[PDB]
Amino acid sequence: LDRIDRNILNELQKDGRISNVELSKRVGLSPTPCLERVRRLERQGFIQGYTALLNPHYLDASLLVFVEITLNRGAPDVFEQFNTAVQKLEEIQECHLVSGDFDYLLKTRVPDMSAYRKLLGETLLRLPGVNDTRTYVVMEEVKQSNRLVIK
Amino acid sequence: LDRIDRNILNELQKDGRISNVELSKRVGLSPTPCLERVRRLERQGFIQGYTALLNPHYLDASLLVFVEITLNRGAPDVFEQFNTAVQKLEEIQECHLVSGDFDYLLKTRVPDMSAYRKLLGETLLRLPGVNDTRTYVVMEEVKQSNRLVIKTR
Amino acid sequence: LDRIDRNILNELQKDGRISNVELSKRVGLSPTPCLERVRRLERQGFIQGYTALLNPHYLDASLLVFVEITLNRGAPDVFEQFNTAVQKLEEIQECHLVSGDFDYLLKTRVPDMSAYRKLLGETLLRLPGVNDTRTYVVMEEVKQSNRLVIK
Amino acid sequence: LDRIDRNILNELQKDGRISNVELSKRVGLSPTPCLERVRRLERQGFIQGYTALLNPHYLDASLLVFVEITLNRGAPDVFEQFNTAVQKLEEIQECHLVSGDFDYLLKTRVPDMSAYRKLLGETLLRLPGVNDTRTYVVMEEVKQSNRLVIKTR
Amino acid sequence: PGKDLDRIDRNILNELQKDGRISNVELSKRVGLSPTPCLERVRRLERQGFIQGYTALLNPHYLDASLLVFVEITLNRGAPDVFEQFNTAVQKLEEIQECHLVSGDFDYLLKTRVPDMSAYRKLLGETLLRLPGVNDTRTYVVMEEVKQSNRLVIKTR
Amino acid sequence: LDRIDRNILNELQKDGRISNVELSKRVGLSPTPCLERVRRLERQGFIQGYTALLNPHYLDASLLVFVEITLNRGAPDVFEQFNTAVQKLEEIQECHLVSGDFDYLLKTRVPDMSAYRKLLGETLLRLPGVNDTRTYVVMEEVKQSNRLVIKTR
Amino acid sequence: LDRIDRNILNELQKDGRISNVELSKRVGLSPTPCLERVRRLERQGFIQGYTALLNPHYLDASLLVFVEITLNRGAPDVFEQFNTAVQKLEEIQECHLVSGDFDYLLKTRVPDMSAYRKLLGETLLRLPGVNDTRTYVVMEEVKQSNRLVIKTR
Amino acid sequence: PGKDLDRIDRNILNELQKDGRISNVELSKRVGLSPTPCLERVRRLERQGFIQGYTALLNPHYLDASLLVFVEITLNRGAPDVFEQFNTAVQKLEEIQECHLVSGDFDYLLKTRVPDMSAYRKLLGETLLRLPGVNDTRTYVVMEEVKQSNRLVIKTR
């Protein structure tokens, strides 16, 4: 939880394609000193992993859509079971248990407007305990970065 | 739109921090032969870039919250203004313009439940055009991966 | 308004590509007798015209979307002017002045989810007098026939 | 995806009832040379078919009305059932499955305002799954053309 | 252009509604024809259905019913007859003079007349919300009645 | 209030065209006796007058439509203007000023849906300072009686 | 009610920890005199007791959340069960049974948003015959005083 | 794991809330330490902020306030301070003991106490709906109070 590392944190999420060469340079250390420090950050918990970003506008997935799901609270394992079922599906980026008129907010991604339809009713609406599902297609995404705010 | 490149992609996202040789190790290729190919993907538009994923639990953003915002269609630049004004605010991660009741959906991470009350109506409600702002706090984030679905085929 | 013509009406909208050869045959007359009758129906008002149907799933227009528009009643020519402005736009199949929470129901058609966005705010939301616009994209069209019901 | 075929299409829709030669008259082609080409479009999938457009004002369908229907998500076959049950009803023209509040949008033409009250709750409300049905009658239809947008280019 | 409604029967109708107690004799004078021909005339109108009946008008102020209020009933459909069950259930309460099934955000527009506000509050819910399956209700108390005439528009040409 | 009177009113309300010889038989009294009572029952102000009921469907007013009208909150006088200016309009059968999200509620009848579109805007929207105007066509007028509730006890 | 008493209550409500020597100075009377009054003021039942106010933020209860709970309309006894079974739950600060779209309203406090997710479902959803359960986290508790309104006049 | 709250100050707190009039002496006995050390102890707690103050509890039944009702206020945002203007405006009416700004379908959850139903009806609108810009309101009358304790949860370990 050292403060000096915060720089190694921001730059790292800024360009995962930065080896000790440039990573352990812009910071203010040598290719070994803190490069072993950013390594410790990978185990400490900070860095959970690394990944590359892509533009679905290319790979069949140029269509993003959110889905509000409201399932009827029946058996105590209502959510527990749901979560341990929705995760087993990769065609859905996110999913959160919120508070209000609905319970979950899935963020599924698909190619065409036709694809999504097929996703729901076949599996999405086939999830355990679902009762109502309001679909919201995004006509324009103006911001999307899992990057946090490191000072 | 290549074949082997697909596995390349799937591999890079399954693990971004990979060495040149390792990146072309279990893919079915030779070191020098195919490891720089990724550059054409980065030049064209396949690879948008690379980034590290940190745990918001161990950083100053332990709390997450969504918001349904509705912009008042006053001037045609109603949307244009919102967009070119919400980006500057690093407090919010994802921002979308959807169809339906509300118009925008913002996924924001405020360190504390109060911080959000602060973010809201001090830099949030004061956004270019806005009628209502229904907020939905997340009690349990169960899935969160910006990873797409690359399928060999 | 002859009854016997109703058959010539249904078949005609059933296959516009039916010349006197087959059209003036299935009915029960000769290639001349009523073929001159279906001609009269074209002037009488019944037949307004003929057209061919296509599947946008091919030609860039595989994305259909409805838009509820609610404009603030300001000057008496509020609708009059609107209608004499929205018609001058071809990228919109239908448009009706309804009664209720909103005033109009446009049926615009476009290629990608990105196209539509560009349509609105640039022109759609630029229409004279508009104040609120709720967008509804169709994820699945299960029926679409301008065909009426002739008995 | 041809060039001249585009003008062909635009012409056919601008006027379906056209003779073989006339269909290839002002397009920039010769009679026999290009008039049967349309067949490949009809065989492939470009031309869905031809139809005549009659005035609902002079027929027994002078009145038009839209309806926002919401189906209750009970069984996954909730949609499948609605679909394979609304087609059989020739009383309704267009039926769509949209996203948002309600789920379906039906454009129907009932001869008289009463006829609709009849159509509704006698063959309408009794459809496979349904919670609410908000109706919006049309006071003035200003635009109605199934014509698409073919642009030369 | 049909209907073919007698140029004279029209005036008859307009007259009867304008005044529902007019004598046939005077009536026949106001329309021209002899008394007898007018009687079997209004009769054939009162027969067909053009005329549903006659009634007297009372002052909603001289009798406990001064307060007039409108209500909007948006009910939940779930028994393909709900609109019928509801309808054939509001015809039993004289405390409501008009019930209509309109399109839009709500389904029913009711016109109710009660003496007090608390008289309405009573009618509301204790008999109103309890009506055949209904979600919520919007209430609009009349502040002033500028126009109110059940008179139709007979085109006496 | 005289019970026989209250009974006269009721009977009369049920049907006023009835003869005194009949109205007398109902209340159980000689013709003249209460016929002079129904007379004073008028003069006093209990009976605003008599009228016949006509079926709109048979004539020309099958389309009954209620309109919700709101006025500009600017000049306060507008309302008083609106009032004495909306009575003249024959097509407007009833107009009430209520308290709530809107200001007035007009009950109008017309033949064609077009007729309405004509009324609205050519004269309806041109009314003394009008802001909003929401329309509600009726699908079924399940009840319409100006009859009050008199208790014959 | 004695004005001095009503004044004693109020003063006491404002702050009860104050000494009698002080509470006596406020009401303008010798210590003993009304100190015996505040005593009978207790015994009678006007004062349910005394308590200190603690800031939740400082301790561990910065997340205050209200939950709307509905029960199964089956067995009527459930409610009586729910009641005497929900009091034991320390995390549930307040529970009221109201009339409306839902049955109860519980005010609970927890440290982490996780803590809530834990409560809800592990014990909260396991309550005596519960049907629906809508949660409402609070962003700002702008007012919280069990103080009543006593009129010192 | 911080805060570092004295194992003894905790019991102090729990005690003070359990009973707000306890004598310091008795208090010091209940926690162990001598009276004096306990006094400058509760003081440093009453100083920092752990303790906001002391109050007596009155019977909402022996005083006109028997009826308790909850209301849900969903207001319209349009003056980026509306939430502040509203908040700093509900703190002037003692007839409302709890006002919270929660997420979801509505914005405010208020807890109001009035003697009569008509007393509430009065508070409602005449002072309620008139509050700093608010759309509509939902009302929930308490039928029975099963649990009600402002007591927090001090972990005396």
Swiss-Prot record, chains B, D, F, G:
Residues 1-62 form the HTH asnC-type domain. The keyword Zinc does not apply. Residues 20-39 bind DNA. InterPro entries: ArsR-like_HTH (IPR011991), AsnC-type_HTH_dom (IPR000485), Dimeric_a/b-barrel (IPR011008), Tscrpt_reg_AsnC-like (IPR019888), Tscrpt_reg_AsnC/Lrp_C (IPR019887), Tscrpt_reg_HTH_AsnC-type_CS (IPR019885), WH-like_DNA-bd_sf (IPR036388), WH_DNA-bd_sf (IPR036390). One of its GO terms (cellular component) is protein-DNA complex. One of its GO terms (biological process) is regulation of DNA-templated transcription. SUPFAM superfamilies: Dimeric alpha+beta barrel, Winged helix' DNA-binding domain. Keywords: Activator, DNA-binding, Transcription, Transcription regulation. It holds the Pfam family AsnC_trans_reg. GO terms for molecular function: DNA-binding transcription activator activity; DNA-binding transcription repressor activity; identical protein binding; sequence-specific DNA binding; transcription cis-regulatory region binding. It comes from the Bacteria. Mediates a global response to leucine. Exogenous leucine affects the expression of a number of different operons; lrp mediates this effect for at least some of these operons. For example it is regulator of the branched-chain amino acid transport genes. PANTHER family: LEUCINE-RESPONSIVE REGULATORY PROTEIN (PTHR30154:SF0). Homodimer. This is Leucine-responsive regulatory protein.
